[PDB]
Amino acid sequence: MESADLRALAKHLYDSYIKSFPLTKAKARAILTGKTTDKSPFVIYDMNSLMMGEDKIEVAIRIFQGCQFRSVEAVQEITEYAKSIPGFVNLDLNDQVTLLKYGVHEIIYTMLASLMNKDGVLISEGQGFMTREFLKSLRKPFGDFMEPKFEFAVKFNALELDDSDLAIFIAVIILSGDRPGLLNVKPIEDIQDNLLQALELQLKLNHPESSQLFAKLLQKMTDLRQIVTEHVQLLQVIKKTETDMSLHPLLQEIYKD
């Protein structure tokens, strides 16, 4: 509740975010906006360039399983980040699991936007870039499975958050007391209150010209919840068609209920 403690918490989370996540938004922007010989990605815009990209860095399935492995890794990274949020490891262990179970999808989407612009997405730790038009043109349900991610990202990126902002935002998401099946909501909300205070001051200091950015950022948690729902519904339709295709137990478990 004291400015200095809120700034200290902001610094702590930012520092920890850098440690836990391989590719920051600042790095991603440097690659995407280019003007750099050294950080230049190989671009995959069609089938042949895919085949060449593998030598450098069914198609829809292989891409799908690519995103799946990355998402598993992201869960791992988010889980490590979560442990650094003051108070989190002290909560009831079941609550820790529940907070992660419901939080990871929202966070993956949020952080995926950092790697995206209107025309595509960074892959393989920035070494590649796959175009939106290619992903959208994948067959059957897969094309329409890729595209909504971009639609979110374009909207979210318009807020122009930097990493220091996202570190605190991602923490707020995890510490949601409104998750189903939580045993002890009160200690969760007490932490979230501190995170929200930290986020509000961060945004006022780091974006003084951007009125009510705090409120606008929270209104995005709405867009996140909706898109996670569509995501799950779309995956289920895929499993029922693609009985050959399989999901990591970790994701299977997250999806359960």
Ligand X SMILES: COc1cccc(COc2cc(C(=O)O)ccc2-c2nn(C(=O)c3c(Cl)cccc3C(F)(F)F)c3ccc(Cl)cc23)c1OC
Exposure string for 226-245, b = 16+ CB within 10 A, e = fewer: ebbeebeeeeeeeeeebeee
Residue from 16, 71, 117, 192 that binds ligand X (CB under 6 A)?
A: 71
DSSP string computed for 76-145: HHHHHHHHTSTTGGGS-HHHHHHHHHHHHHHHHHHHHHHTEETTEEEEGGGTEEEEHHHHHTSTTTHHHH
Of the listed pieces 73-81, 211-219, 237-245, 247-255, which binds its own copies according to CB under 8 A? 211-219
Q: Which position among 32, 135, 217, 224 is part of the footprint of ligand X (CB under 6 A)?
A: 135
Q: Which of 42, 49, 61, 68 binds ligand X (CB under 6 A)?
A: 68
Check the annotation: does 248 bind a ligand. no
Q: Is 211 in the site for its own copies (CB under 8 A)?
A: yes
Binding of ligand X at residue 224 (CB under 6 A)? no
Q: Contact at 8 Å (CB) between 42 and 53?
A: yes
Could you give the string, one character per residue 141-180, with x where binding to ligand X holds by CB under 6 A and - elsewhere? -----x--x-------------------------------
The footprint of ligand X on residues 84-123 (CB under 6 A) is 105, 108-109, 111-112, 115, 121, 123
Contact 107, 76 (CB under 8 A): no
Residue 147 within binding range of its own copies, rule CB under 8 A: no
Residue 169 assigned to a binding site: no
CB of 164 to ligand X, least distance (A): 18
Give, in order, the Cα–Cα distances in Å from 150 to each of 8, 14, 112, 115, 157: 34, 25, 9, 10, 10
- For the CA atoms of 21, 25, 31, 33, the dihedral, rounded to the nearest 10 degrees, stands at 170
In the chain, count of helices (H) and strands (E)?
Answer: 11, 4
207 marked as binding residue: no
Retrieve residue 217's tokens.
Answer: 């950022």
The correct pick among 10, 99, 130, 217 for binding ligand X (CB under 6 A) is 130
Buried b (16+ CB within 10 A) or exposed e, 127-138: ebbbbbebbeeb
Q: For residue 215, state whether it binds its own copies (rule: CB under 8 A).
A: yes
Contact call for residues 163 and 16 (beta carbons, < 8 A): no
Beta partners for 120? 117, 131
Nearest residue (CB) to its own copies, 46 versus 144: 144
Partner whose binding site includes residue 115, from its own copies, ligand X, none (CB under 5 to 8 Å by kind): ligand X
Q: Which residues are annotated as a binding site?
A: 68-71, 105, 231, 255
Q: Which residues are annotated as a binding site for rosiglitazone?
A: 68-71, 105, 231, 255
Task: Enumerate binding residues for ligand X (CB under 6 A).
Answer: 63, 66-68, 70-71, 74, 105, 108-109, 111-112, 115, 121, 123-124, 130, 135, 146, 149, 235, 251
